[PDB]
Amino acid sequence: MDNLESQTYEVFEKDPIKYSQYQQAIYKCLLDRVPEEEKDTNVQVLMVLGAGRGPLVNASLRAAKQADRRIKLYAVEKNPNAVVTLENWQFEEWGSQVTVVSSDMREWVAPEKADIIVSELLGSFADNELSPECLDGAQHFLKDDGVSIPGEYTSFLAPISSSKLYNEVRACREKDRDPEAQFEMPYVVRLHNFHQLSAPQPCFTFSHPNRDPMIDNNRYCTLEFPVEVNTVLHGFAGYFETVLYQDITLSIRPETHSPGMFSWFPILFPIKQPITVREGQTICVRFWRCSNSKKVWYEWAVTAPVCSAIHNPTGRSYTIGL
Amino acid sequence: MDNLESQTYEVFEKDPIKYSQYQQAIYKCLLDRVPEEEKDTNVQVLMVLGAGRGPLVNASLRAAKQADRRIKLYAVEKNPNAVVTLENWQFEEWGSQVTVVSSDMREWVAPEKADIIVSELLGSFADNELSPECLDGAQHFLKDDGVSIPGEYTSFLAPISSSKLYNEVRACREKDRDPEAQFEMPYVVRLHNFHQLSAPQPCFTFSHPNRDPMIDNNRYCTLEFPVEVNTVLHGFAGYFETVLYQDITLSIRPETHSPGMFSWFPILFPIKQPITVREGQTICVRFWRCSNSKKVWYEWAVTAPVCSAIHNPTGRSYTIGL
Amino acid sequence: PPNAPACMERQLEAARYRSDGALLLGASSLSGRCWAGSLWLFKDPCAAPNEGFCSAGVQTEAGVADLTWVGERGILVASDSGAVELWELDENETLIVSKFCKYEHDDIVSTVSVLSSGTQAVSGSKDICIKVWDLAQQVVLSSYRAHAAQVTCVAASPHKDSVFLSCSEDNRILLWDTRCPKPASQIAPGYLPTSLAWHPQQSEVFVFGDENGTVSLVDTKSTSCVLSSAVHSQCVTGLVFSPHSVPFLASLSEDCSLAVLDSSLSELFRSQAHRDFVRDATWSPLNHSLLTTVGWDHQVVHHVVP
Amino acid sequence: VSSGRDLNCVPEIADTLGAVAKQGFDFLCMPVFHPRFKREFIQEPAKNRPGPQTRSDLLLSGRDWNTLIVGKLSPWIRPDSKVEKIRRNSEAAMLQELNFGAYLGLPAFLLPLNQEDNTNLARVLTNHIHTGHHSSMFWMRVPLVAPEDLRDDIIENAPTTHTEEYSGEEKTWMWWHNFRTLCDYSKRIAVALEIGADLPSNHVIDRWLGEPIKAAILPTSIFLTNKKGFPVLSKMHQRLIFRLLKLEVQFIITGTNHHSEKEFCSYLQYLEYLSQNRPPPNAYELFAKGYEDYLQSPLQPL
Ligand SMILES: Nc1ncnc2c1ncn2[C@@H]1O[C@H](C[C@@H](N)CC[C@H](N)C(=O)O)[C@@H](O)[C@H]1O
């Protein structure tokens, strides 16, 4: 529903590892797709779906030079303001090799099928920027044997204690809306003064392409977190891991965090009322990924040691517009 | 977004003129479409788009018996609860002649094209129940020479004075929303204690089928209302007229009101602040019909004798979900 | 050729045939990094718009909003900078040198027209002013603020040095005679006038195009537009009369088409060759059946009018 | 004196900005798309015009876009046109330019009020203000005197009115008042008051009192010339400058140099001369500085 600002693209382009990992993934994929004997006759069709101002376009070109393989590039971008940067760069630097497309990947009628679809539509909680829905509407122009980079992603959740963050969320009460709406929405936050109460556990997973006859992006997960400490539960930290290609991965999970990667901060799902947890008790949380044709949202509830209210029912406080 | 209750369908089925007018329109259309020499060989394909509990289905059958013509009926209905009534009636009374379809007319893949599409998707302000959008998604399964009943509809507006209604709208202030949202939304109301300040004037018109290369349901109208009285403007009454077929029409305009027709009450578009109007002054109002892929809404403003704020900008207070 | 740029800017603004048959081209860069302009001379019109096949070429400081021939070697330009600039073709006609660049307008110079004598010119601007220039002295003789909005078009009468027309976004069509103390005369309000063309033989007759795509025929003495036609689906950008004894009228629009009309404004020819806004039309003095058009699609199309 | 240069011609953005900064200007008002580059949004083939649609955001640093550039709406954008096709393309183009300005993080964006009916312009701007997340200022360019009322009396069959029209002479205040009423007093919408060669009567000037004037537009053509050839202002113009200096408005210089023998920064040097020669702050103003129009809740004395 919104378009990113120029300076937002600018800061994230400074990520020291995200783009070198993407380049390495494309490099490995090109060598596995076209052998040495075909290096000058086989042209691989690469599509950067959500090109931004063009850093994955440059990463794709550098990877093709590294692999000594031939590529035909498409740079698809829905943000028309970012398209200005893309079309000025295409005229001055890239040339005919890169075809710039000003369109939503779900509505674009591609002139040919792709060998490789490259995208970075991931959110802090993996699928909260609607990468499943966007890539589902784009997989029809991917070859039957075609590859999607990233191939899969998994979100992670961990219960947390933070009276400081509980107070920050509480202070988000706004006029002209439900007085508790602020507790029924996630926040992107560089978590600092908190206590992680149990090791992160995998929540939701998505794989690309999705060749199932009935595609369903809705999800329901039950997580049981052993707690070996007396504490107060205030919410859940959300992280993700992604498989770009084979062993080339990215992670924001604290235990496996990709070095120097600032492109994603964790997410925080708050709870309306703090919950007392004693040593040896288990925190049980339920998360739902819900949707209709217009929007996507999450619903969540604590069921042990005590029940909380169901948070964000029907997306009454928070939705991600399609 | 919502489905009508059983008793809502029940009361409107008691309309003494709406259905006899629809029957008369279908009757006239059948005689004009198939001559006497073809009365036993030509079967006209009729589609009731939004069949409800089936009264237009019975009106279509009675019209075919009246015209002594052959018809094949389709009763399309998106409300699955109304579909129960339709399928029980089809088994017990109609039989094979009527094919019941449980679907949205915009998503239904018809097995054959229609000669006549019959619908009653009209609101108090004609197009406020999204008849243009619904019939636009349904016209692809209408023959190149096919007829739509209704063929056209026009909304009407009239400035009104009512301190009583102004107070009723004012009392609609709700918690957990903008304190003036109640003035930025229309209301269906049987207007009684009011003063119509100028004769109703046509606002927006839609025609079916719409064979234009670029279909645009968005609208912008400027209306100038001569006022020959000292008064206070509180809002605008909305009415409509529809051409079912040729001279067979329906109207809720007070001057041409269809007798006994209670199926539509007028609509009221309020204004946040009452406006003083002196004898001989002109009330100038601007109305916009706006949309995106998810919703439709109206925006309105008074520009003479004084300007009001633009009401309902971006549909912040009121939208009709697609 | 030397001093000529290796690349011509995409947006072709003007095309003017010289009496000998040489083609003058005006272009602007209306997008990308640099918003400048260029002037081109093509002794072979079929070679246009290829830079390697031009007779002469030069880069201007800013975009070319309009241009006109000043005799056989002079080129008068309406610039985005607010300048009216005179460029002169050298002795060997292989270079285009600047004679003057005078910044007298406070906004974009949108239109220029050389007066009948060829010694004076009229410029119109977004700054709402109309100026009368002395080309030899390189100065402004008179400055007129008659309009109330941007001047869209200025057209010098074919044979009277003191008579010209102007039209603007203020919805006025003004008939000028600089021999009067109040030089302008307004000739029911409707759609905005966007283009003007004096009839080449009937000294008191002119045509005007509007923002709604309508072309109208007017007689200054009668002051009535009894003859009109809905020619285009969009704004009439330009109106150019053919060099014939009984002239044809070319009308160019933002609907990307070119139309050729007769004396009663009836269509004889319609061309959809352009894939973007048709900006100018020039009839060949050598072959009267040939009409050349330029567009924002960088196309130089040669039409055979029946 | 916080001052800006207004330009409608920018061949190279870095060269132009460097040139205006050298002259002493703190900011530049410029088009974000080429002012003559009319764009089609609905009908083919012009709708499918290959890009780029304007120049790149990469041409300037983030800091420069946020502090030195004031955007300007293209002159062909007419959302209140009598032609339906022009109204629709103008709405789409206005949203495009406004969103490009939001994309660049421009501190302000100039839009004109040059006619009585700006209803659809108000509606499109209100829609933009209530869409997405941005906090840019909208400066409505409005003249003290309408061009129709300051035109030279040179139309033989359309003479200028010689009889006084008290309310008629304040018509541009009503254009502003109506626009801001439609936009429901948005704190993001302010006035860019354009001064002309002939100042109107005092009552016309006084209508602007209490209005949110953020900028004052000074065309080079309003400046008189002294014995030394330097640009100056009449005593009446100077009086208005001192009134606007108390409101701490940003001064904008528009038009070309009309004192060609002198350097361009001379128009700016005259403004700082006026600013340096204004009355010094008295004892009251020394303490009251910074409290102007700042609302304070009265104390509970007991
Ligand atoms: N459905 C969509 N169709 C096309 N582009 C999209 C879509 N959804 C998101 N985008 C764009 O995808 C980009 C997502 C960014 N996270 C990535 C930017 C850039 N490729 C980078 O790695 O820095 C943004 O520029 C979005 O505007």
Ligand SMILES: Nc1ncnc2c1ncn2[C@@H]1O[C@H](C[C@@H](N)CC[C@H](N)C(=O)O)[C@@H](O)[C@H]1O
């Ligand atoms: N897009 C749609 N597709 C299918 N049915 C629809 C759609 N929109 C509305 N309807 C149905 O159309 C009917 C509209 C009613 N006003 C008419 C009911 C009935 N035909 C009558 O005349 O009493 C309702 O039953 C709606 O559920």
Ligand SMILES: O=C(NC[C@@H](O)[C@@H]1Cc2ccccc2CN1)c1ccnc(NC2CCC2)c1
């Ligand atoms: O998680 C974040 N935002 C969403 C996330 O999905 C983000 C969104 C985005 C948007 C455009 C381009 C790339 C990306 C990268 N992915 C985020 C937000 C704010 N600041 C961050 N890091 C700071 C900047 C200095 C350290 C991170």
Ligand SMILES: O=C(NC[C@@H](O)[C@@H]1Cc2ccccc2CN1)c1ccnc(NC2CCC2)c1
């Ligand atoms: O205008 C009305 N409602 C919308 C209108 O579009 C309505 C909606 C509807 C819904 C289902 C079937 C038919 C219809 C007919 N069209 C309306 C609402 C309430 N009461 C009404 N009349 C009373 C009942 C006793 C007199 C009228």
